[PDB]
Symmetry: D2
Subunit: 363 residues, 4 copies
């Protein structure tokens, strides 16, 4: 039966948002089966802001290339593949796409140590505009996260190391509708904040019970160590992509996580790499750097403008969003030596999630 | 007579916040008459028209003149004031106050070599000289003079050379036209000529190799330009066996945009014994880092395409990245991170970085 | 006694270029002791942390103090210094030097009404006051005081009210927390504009409450131009009006910019100030216009003449708004040294309408 | 045979919003086979790496090809697609759809002259040709060809010439080893072909330094690697069946509205200083190029427009505010922001297309 999952990740460069050359070659060479693709996680060149059309262009170009390789119309990929493009690739970040596959096999290969990577996906019930940034969004995301854990065959939340949530944002047209029906409305960071909390609820990090509309954009004590949330568009359907480990994984990869303690801290990144399975003290050898397949780091602006006792400009800077990612990228790439890293963030808030996927090889 | 150089790093919350700078003198901690340089990072764009940078300069000069009890004018040959604009990300704006006194006695038990400061001034650099061989020669002479002022003869003991030169203005280019002369094209012509001057003076580049057509390396030049002052200025940081200073300087070369080995080499050759990472005690031995993060020579990094040369905010991002690398090693946000110019100092895609670290008696 | 107000517009090549400013006094053209306001545009970002703006402020204060022969600290209550940062496109950085003296006799043959300046200061505005009803009341009182200082009783004769107020800092929040209080820039600005509206009888005071402050666009002042920052708990009001007993050789007028491409507000300002023209100004008429003070806040919607615009989404929206406002004003007056402020998000004029005021020559 | 050119201006809410564009064809209002140019403004930076601009190009081509029922590859010589990125302030992103049919009969009562469109292609422009005399010559030949395509012999009847050329990449340089230069060379090519600049005056040395050599009507851009230069030319002709006429003017400085007004006036609107609402609606489109000025002195005063880091964006913001303040129409083609051979020192070209109705 569809019994053991085998997830893989292939990281391929993009020279522009619409450069799918090396992405298409992955399928055309028979290296990867397009039907087994479950997620595309990408960095694009551009502003990274709410109206970054270059980000949308990469999304459209990647969907089109994948649909062509699968031989379907693009309109099919819509529920079957998570496509997550984070805009803004400053400094050392090389734009790319991480192609995530998963197949299920009937038998577990021999000699795979410890736990291994597994992917789960889930979808929310429709989130109405009067739900956005409020307790209904939290509950609905939490259910989709529970569903993604179930899809991955994972029951222990401690084995979940990264949860990507894509939700809807408000538009004047959605407001128009709540308004029609007699409803008030709250928008991107509300949605993002509600989603992260949903993750926390579903992973048992925050009791439910503690949730209410008035805690949502406020009580920083309530948090998920592993949520990475974004919003936009109008799709009332929330989407969850969940990366975990399981003892029964056939995958040749393992995931781990850490928490970036402040804006100059490398210990979160290192912890991610270490708990994913690389045994190292302070720095990675070249061989160990190459064990690291991908890093997914979310570099939200810090909660204060005080860093190691000193004033910094990171909250005042008009280019703050761009700088946060520039810094996060420099930190990750200085450790791993790999410019094609998933560095997202730059939203307003001091700890940030980072996850690392590393090779897990048979004995 | 023995030089004793010191450095005091103090924070600035804005370009005109000289509170903690003035306290240094008012507390008797530091003698304002011994100040030979102010090296500062200000908040702002870091571009050619960054008025916040000029504001810090003016505020720092005014505060120093007041502490010395002189008018601000009387300070203009005697102190190098170098403000680099643009303090993205982890860079905390600040001023490094550099002092030097000469003492009659060399304290006992100071290991190896020690920090020494030298300063120099060029003969006037005409607008037809900018970016051309004349600027090179004139900077080289000012660097030689700064070595002589520091009592240093060995160029291998020079670890950082800051040059401030003039840039073209429309009125300068009017003047050269007046006298029947062409101008070169501009801040970066000046900067490139200056770096080469440093190289010539340190024996890094033979002079016969210089001509206007080569002008677009020194491992240790950190050059900038602007204004109209025809007088070039040189600030030189070195070591000497006869230094009374409780500090030592070292340098390295940043190999590419993600490399930390240049920074680490700077710290290590300055005197900190470490393998890969610094302990907290060792991080606190590092008093200041002076890193220049010019954009790289190509858009290929570890075999992959990067956006750093195409980005409209490239100048700001270069410093953001450089700052992140330095501060991730030293834990000290008040670091001197300059740069963001387009890519003649350092090897190709290579950037200079210097570190000043404690040198304590036995 | 009869007020005599004047305005002299001088260029600045940088935020610390006070050359042409100092020449005004050194040439005997203007008496520095009679300066009551400096209204300036500086080069820079125009954002909350625009240090180039502060640099112009400090430079202008220092030059003025030196010309007066006082320490710079004396000019703190006696002169309004208002520097708006951000001079995109056709806007030439400059300082408008506003003077006022009072004379014992009213010259003959001055037509209609004439310019008068008034100033006021608020009682201290605590951080728990910012963006709330207390700020409104305190600004309103300072506006009433400025009218009284100008000798003006009719709000219809008031054509421009500049308010500078405090903004929140973490350190102010800390204080209000310390005393068991909550807190809440645009809040401050919105509360100030409403204060102006209250004091000019444009909005009845019963309509005011903390919940309306930033939400009910129906409450607005046609002539408020508000800003905030720093920590100075003292609000400041500079008020430009006319009066039948003015000895000034200038008159002020105002208009409302109807949308982002509209020139009729600017033209109405110029026309009601006294220039008689149908659609476009001759060169002689353009030179009658001494200064324009236009506030170009972002619009309330992204729909302009039935089409979508990017002005609310643009990361550079603040800068673009001023670029556009400046282009409109300068295309009419031909004078790049115009006071174009704004770029805040959209209580100041009607839905998305923007105030503009014009000062023009009024000759015997 | 008589040309009948038309223009339909439709909004875009995003670079990939082709909804109103597709409705034009689906409603039978416009025949997609008659489309000869798409001239568009997109939201984005307007800089060399503006991918949003490329996105609009791709989206528009794909929509048009779908409406024609061909593969997108077949539009590649038959339709000029020109997207200028950067839509600050009052500029509403949109596409001007330009059609042209040739008809057997010339309608009665069409006053004066009327709009006609011509197109041309250069021979391949090698990278060693870019910014040099070869690019000039090759562009000039393509402009002569576009005139011939439009049936126009009098350069005075040409009011707008858009040239798209290649820019350099490290990979093109590599080959020759075996942007503004390109734009400058192209403008000069236009000038040569329209008789505005004698060809003996051209040399690699004058290109981008002798400002005395200029075209009043060139609007040039570059990018990509396509060695093929493209020319789109808008003119009038006495034998036009078109219900439109084009005119042009020169913007004298950054705050000047007289160039815009001259464009509208010479295109056929009779007005003194300001347009009535009826007259504003006669103006179908304006194509204005707002290159940064040659100096930082404006009406005797210093401006920041050359020093500003956002200069390119601001120039268009200003140009757009001027155009829209006259016409009341946010969907206007405002390009530019390059550093300052499109027009006199300090001067910028602007063209206007206005209604020309039967008697």
């Amino acid at each position: 039966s569809a019994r053991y999952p085998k997830a893989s990740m292939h990281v391929v460069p993009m020279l522009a948002p619409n450069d799918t050359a090396a992405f298409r070659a992955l399928f055309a060479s028979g290296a990867v089966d397009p039907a087994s693709v479950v997620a595309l996680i990408a960095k694009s060149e551009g502003s990274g802001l709410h109206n970054d059309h270059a980000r949308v262009f990469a999304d459209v170009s990647l969907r089109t290339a994948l649909a062509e390789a699968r031989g379907c119309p693009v309109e099919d990929l819509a529920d079957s593949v998570t496509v997550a493009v984070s805009g803004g690739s400053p400094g050392v970040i090389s734009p790319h796409v991480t192609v995530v596959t998963q197949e299920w096999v009937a038998d577990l290969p021999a000699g795979l140590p410890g736990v291994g990577l597994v992917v789960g996906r889930g979808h929310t019930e429709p989130i109405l505009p009067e739900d956005i940034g409020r307790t209904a969004q939290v509950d609905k995301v939490a259910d989709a996260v529970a569903a993604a854990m179930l899809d991955a065959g994972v029951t222990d939340p401690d084995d979940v190391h990264l949860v990507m949530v894509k939700g809807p944002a408000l538009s004047s047209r959605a407001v128009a509708d709540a308004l029609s029906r007699g409803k008030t409305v709250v928008s991107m960071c509300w949605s993002n904040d509600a989603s992260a909390l949903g993750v926390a609820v579903a992973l048992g990090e925050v009791k439910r019970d503690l949730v209410a509309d008035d805690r949502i954009r406020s009580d920083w004590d309530l948090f998920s160590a592993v949520a990475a949330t974004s919003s936009g568009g109008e799709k009332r359907g929330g989407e969850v992509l969940l990366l975990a480990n399981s003892a029964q994984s056939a995958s040749e990869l393992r995931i781990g996580h850490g928490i970036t303690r402040d804006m100059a801290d490398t210990e979160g990144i290192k912890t991610a790499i270490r708990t994913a399975g690389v045994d190292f003290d302070c720095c990675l050898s070249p061989a160990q750097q190459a064990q690291v397949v991908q890093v997914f780091g979310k570099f939200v602006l810090p909660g204060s403008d005080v860093l190691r006792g000193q004033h910094i400009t990171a909250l005042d800077d008009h280019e703050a969003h761009h700088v946060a990612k520039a810094v996060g990228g420099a930190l990750v790439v200085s450790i791993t030596g790999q410019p094609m890293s998933f560095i997202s963030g730059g939203e307003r808030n001091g700890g940030n999630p980072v996850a690392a996927v590393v090779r897990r090889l048979p004995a």
